[PDB]
Design a protein around this nucleic acid. Structure first.
Ligand SMILES: Nc1ncnc2c1ncn2[C@@H]1O[C@H](COP(=O)(O)OP(=O)(O)OP(=O)(O)O)[C@@H](O)[C@H]1O
Ligand SMILES: [Ca+2]
Ligand SMILES: [Ca+2]
Ligand SMILES: [Ca+2]
Ligand SMILES: [Ca+2]
Ligand SMILES: [Ca+2]
Ligand SMILES: [Ca+2]
Length: 901
DNA sequence: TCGTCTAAGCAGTCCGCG
DNA sequence: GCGGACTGCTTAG
């Protein structure tokens, strides 16, 4: 097999590399890598190296990496550009793996671990590590085993051995319900004392050294705790055995409000699963506890126990250990679903970077571009300092707030990456500038043609047309990968809808789910067999289809994220290729494109309808347009339609055969006007929306920019078994809105769009009457909590104190004295509830850590003093008032002359 | 929240507005 | 009470 790296580090003048050799064996080597850098040289000098602008360069070969680094400094002292890859390990990888890497994940040791630490006096601080580590569960992907290290004797209590037999039993048998599928994979090791546990753990770690290290909060908690505890007990040299090169660094992580410390283990790639999840999941969660996320992702029940976790080991050590094992397994289950480790490996090996660098699109793109240019003997420029400067973004149309009955939406495929490719926007393709007219002059095609030679953007920039820039070339490769995975995702989605339909008529039989690839549209033979299956088999197939769709979603949306982040990197001062001329060229072309096509679509539809000056495009944001189809439906007449699906087919046909060709023509003209390199503005129909045929539903409404709801029957070619609400920006979509209020507002919207005013009024009247019974957590607001210190003046709110911070300060006073009740953590999330006048807490609200029950000593008082009236008015009635006034209807029945009877 | 970008919404504080 | 200046937070792209 072809060799591939696992990890790479620079330590002084050595590169330390762990890798898989040609026989599939893990090896480690130390290499005295001699880097090269470059300087500009005179024209009359036969070199093969040229900078990205075609200027000749001479290669400088250094005796060692420190010499190269010293040379860079002196070049700054002189005031001359020092060209080339200054991150020497990336140059090492490029030289060592000069081919497309094919990796074998089965050879990469992926470790998932979690530790337990009993602490009587509050949260056990990793930097102090003053309490014994009393449990470690470490899952190894190569062995496929959970290694359990269990401390039986501690200053906080001596306990009996954990029993695998009780662990496997149902909770109704007094057991822990450790999943049967992992029972045989547990290797249990009890220990008489902490010193022997840790020494054995280090010997184990040496035998089975993680390449990828993950878990939940491992970077902020488990790793620094283990490191510091070993350091405290045994000394520094022993703690450094966590690094296969015996090198570590205490690294400070800084932001706006303060800083924290993590341990860098040289030769390990730490990918904390919480960080993978936050970057790649495209969720915003009220809480990031593993328990909360596991429930959300897997629909598993909360890991339940009595008393505080600080007394769990001594009260129920059996459960204590079982829950530690289950916690490790939960992370593996989330990854089986979301596949973020797979994603990270794919991206890391593609770019030829340290796997942990996948968190940084700037590092990722720097390496992709460097490797690309190196292939042509071209030399990358030196990174420079730039001051942060604001620059303009997308256009968003101001909608008229209203109901909108029939709506068709259209959207540009991968807009900004397509603009880059179409215009040929790249650091080395800049050709010059032209004199800019106001944007509306280009939008209305009255401005002079910018250039007869170069490819243009309406911000004044011109680009070469003779060859593709490196940015268009590399962005195209990732875009093409994204396109493939989006295809699999959408097929799985369509396949899912086939199963949902069949589930309406499940056969009374005993059978099996079909063995199929859900990434491909089901054949006619599969569709025929599906119609004969039982509900059991259909449900299992639906689960599998939805898992395939999730897998596809991860792969496609994060490739989209990467290419969109290359645009973003052009506007980030730390990117080697930062250039606000290119960043604004992209965004300004984008503004033109949307408003250009708005004009074209209006002109086309006014023509086919025989009207003048009427606005069919009701809304647009960045690269999308929303087209009122009322007049199209009214031209055939509603009475002519057999059912909802009949008018959906008609609009689908109209959009594909009439609108899209008109849109394509409009964009081809715009491409010619700007003299672009290649027409790539492809705007396809997205949603078909409207009320159910014969109903009183309003179909859709807009309240303002970035705030609307639509009843959608077909989305990007997926025809739903049941209509789906597409709600953007409204309170139902915000993590700050209480869970039960999100649910109630969504039902109000469903009724508005599908059923009408009377239905909405029935539901509102019931929610208002019953809501006081809702669980306090389900009606609590949520917020991030930054700068608690700033607003704390002797335990009381200072000037301009935010409402949620005020709640935290109330909480802090109520739990004062306790180093056992949960503390609010700076920068994390809190639940917030309003408090009625005259309460014992002495303020108008209280806040506590999100994803948790409020501590029992104040729980009863919070419950007694909760202000349900304020809660209802603020989270539910206020937003609903906004929805209903925009849609021109009433959530409460107004008086009529019929009341006389 | 270490980690690519801008546009823009709403909640809330403070305070004017005769 | 509203809304403007402002902070804070959270969305849509
Ligand atoms: N996370 C982001 N970072 C930088 N730019 C973004 C991001 N999200 C959206 N944009 C910009 O907005 C444009 C339109 O966004 P949109 O959500 O329609 O995605 P898209 O790139 O057009 O891909 P799709 O093909 O899925 O529509 C993007 O092309 C760009
Ligand atoms: Ca735990
Ligand atoms: Ca798009
Ligand atoms: Ca599309
Ligand atoms: Ca059937
Ligand atoms: Ca869009
Ligand atoms: Ca206001």
């Amino acid at each position: 097999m072809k060799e591939f790296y696992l990890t790479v580090e620079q330590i002084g003048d050595s590169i330390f590399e762990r890798y898989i050799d040609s026989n599939g064996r893990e090896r480690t080597r130390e290499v005295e890598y001699k880097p090269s850098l470059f300087a500009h040289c005179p024209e009359s000098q036969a070199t093969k190296y040229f900078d990205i602008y075609g200027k000749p360069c001479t290669r400088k070969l250094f005796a060692n990496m420190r010499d190269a680094s010293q040379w860079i400094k002196r070049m700054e002292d002189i005031g001359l550009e020092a060209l080339g890859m200054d991150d020497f390990k990336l140059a090492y990888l490029s030289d060592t793996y000069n081919y497309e890497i094919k990796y074998d994940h089965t050879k990469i040791r992926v470790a998932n671990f979690d530790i337990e630490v009993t602490s009587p006096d509050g949260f056990p601080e990793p930097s102090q590590a003053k309490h014994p580590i009393d449990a470690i569960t470490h899952y190894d992907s190569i062995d496929d085993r959970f290694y359990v290290f269990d401390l039986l004797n501690s200053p906080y209590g001596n306990v009996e051995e954990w029993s695998i037999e009780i662990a496997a039993k149902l909770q109704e048998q007094g057991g822990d319900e450790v999943p049967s599928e992992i029972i045989d994979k547990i290797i249990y090791m009890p220990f008489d004392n902490e010193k022997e546990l840790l020494m054995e753990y280090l010997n184990f770690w040496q035998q089975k050294t993680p390449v990828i290290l993950t878990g939940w909060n491992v970077e902020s908690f488990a790793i620094p705790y283990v490191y510091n505890r070993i350091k405290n007990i045994f000394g520094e040299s022993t703690a450094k055995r966590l690094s296969p090169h015996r090198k570590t660094r205490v690294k400070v992580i800084e932001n706006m409000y303060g800083s924290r410390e993590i341990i860098t283990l040289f030769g390990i790639s730490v990918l904390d699963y919480i960080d993978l999840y936050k970057k790649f999941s495209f969720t915003n969660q009220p809480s990031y506890s593993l328990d909360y996320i596991s429930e959300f992702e897997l629909n598993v029940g909360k890991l339940k126990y009595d008393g505080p976790i600080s007394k769990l080991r001594e009260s129920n050590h059996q459960r204590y250990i079982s829950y530690n094992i289950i916690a490790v397994y939960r992370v593996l289950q989330i990854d089986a679903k979301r596949q973020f480790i797979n994603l990270s490996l794919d991206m890391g090996y593609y770019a030829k970077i340290q796997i942990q660098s996948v968190f940084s699109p700037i590092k990722t793109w720097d390496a992709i571009i460097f490797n690309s240019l190196k292939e042509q003997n071209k030399v990358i420029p030196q990174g420079r300092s730039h001051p942060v400067q604001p620059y303009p973004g997308a256009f968003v149309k101001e909608p008229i707030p209203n109901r909108y009955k029939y709506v068709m939406s259209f959207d540009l495929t991968s807009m900004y990456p397509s603009i880059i490719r179409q215009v040929n926007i790249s650091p080395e393709t800049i050709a010059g500038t032209f004199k800019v007219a106001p944007l509306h002059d280009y939008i209305n095609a009255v401005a002079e043609r910018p250039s007869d030679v170069y490819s243009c953007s309406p911000n004044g920039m011109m680009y070469y047309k003779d060859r593709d820039g490196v940015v268009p070339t590399e962005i195209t490769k990732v875009f093409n990968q994204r396109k493939e995975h989006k295809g699999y995702m959408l097929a799985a989605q369509r396949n899912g809808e086939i199963i949902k339909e069949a589930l309406h008529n499940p056969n009374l039989s005993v059978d099996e789910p079909l063995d199929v690839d859900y990434r491909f549209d089901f054949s006619d033979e599969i569709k025929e067999k599906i119609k004969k299956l039982s509900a059991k088999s259909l449900n299992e197939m639906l689960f599998r289809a939805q898992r395939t769709e999730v897998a596809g979603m991860t792969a496609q949306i994060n490739r989209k994220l990467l290419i969109n982040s290359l645009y973003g990197a052009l506007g980030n001062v730390w990117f080697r290729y930062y250039d606000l001329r290119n960043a604004t060229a992209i965004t300004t072309f984008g503004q033109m494109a949307l408003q250009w096509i708005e004009r074209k679509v209006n002109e086309y539809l006014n023509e086919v309808c025989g009207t003048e000056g009427e606005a069919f495009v009701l809304y647009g944001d960045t690269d999308s347009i929303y087209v009122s189809a009322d007049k199209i439906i009214d031209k055939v007449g509603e009475s002519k339609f057999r059912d909802t699906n009949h008018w959906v087919d008609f609009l689908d046909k109209f959009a594909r055969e009439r609108m899209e060709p008109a849109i394509d023509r409009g964009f081809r003209e715009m491409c010619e006007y700007m003299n672009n390199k290649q027409h790539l503005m492809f705007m396809d129909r997205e949603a078909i929306a409207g009320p159910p045929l014969g109903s009183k539903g309003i179909g859709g409404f807009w309240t303002g920019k970035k705030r609307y709801a639509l009843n959608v029957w077909d989305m990007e070619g997926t025809r739903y078994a049941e209509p789906k609400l597409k709600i953007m920006g409204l309170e139902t979509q915000k993590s700050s809105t209480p869970k039960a209020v999100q649910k109630a507002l969504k039902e109000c919207i469903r009724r508005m769009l599908q059923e009408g005013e009377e239905s909405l009024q029935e539901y509102f009247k019931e929610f208002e009457k019953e809501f006081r019974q809702l669980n306090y957590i389900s009606i609590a607001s949520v917020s991030s909590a930054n700068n608690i210190a700033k607003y704390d003046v002797g335990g009381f709110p200072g000037p301009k104190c935010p409402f949620h911070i005020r709640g935290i300060l109330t909480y802090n006073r109520a739990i004062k004295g306790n180093i056992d009740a949960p503390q609010v953590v700076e920068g994390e999330k809190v639940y917030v509830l309003p408090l009625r006048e005259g309460n014992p807490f002495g303020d108008k609200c209280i806040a506590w850590p999100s994803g948790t029950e409020i501590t029992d000593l104040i729980k009863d008082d919070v419950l007694h003093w909760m202000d349900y009236t304020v809660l209802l008015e603020k989270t539910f009635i206020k937003p609903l008032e906004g929805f209903t006034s925009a849609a021109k209807l009433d959530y409460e029945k107004k008086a009529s002359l019929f009341d006389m009877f």
